Design a binder for this molecule. Structure first.
Ligand SMILES: [Zn+2]
Length: 122
């Protein structure tokens, strides 16, 4: 439905249709195209209480920007899963993504069967 932009440089980030919510907290982004729009630096940690194993920090790929976009994690069998920092984004016009969430219907919940269809284990 709507597009998120990097809050610092305004480069296109992703669509709200791309976002899934895990455990009513984590905002993950579906699709391999999104991975073209950020870079990462390693920051591996063992599993935390909710089953996220941190792998990296995400940065806007605009080299003049490099805004903190979030982290990537492994959750279940899904590695390199981007978890966006919702404070880091604004909406295409200008309101920020946190404001937009507050006045819009809830985003779609994560569905493991949908995820498995998109990223099959074979
Ligand atoms: Zn940026």
């Amino acid at each position: 439905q709507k597009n998120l932009l990097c809050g610092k440089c305004k480069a296109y980030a992703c669509s709200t249709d791309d976002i899934r919510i895990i455990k009513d907290s984590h905002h993950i982004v579906l699709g391999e195209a999104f991975k073209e729009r950020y870079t990462t630096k390693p920051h591996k940690k063992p599993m935390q209480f909710d089953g996220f194993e941190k792998k990296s920090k995400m940065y806007c790929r605009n080299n003049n920007c490099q805004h903190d976009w979030g982290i990537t994690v492994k959750y279940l069998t899904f590695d390199n899963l981007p978890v966006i920092k919702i404070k880091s984004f604004v909406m295409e016009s200008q309101m920020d993504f946190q404001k937009w969430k507050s006045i819009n219907s809830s985003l779609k919940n994560f569905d493991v069967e949908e995820m498995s269809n998109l990223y099959p284990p074979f």
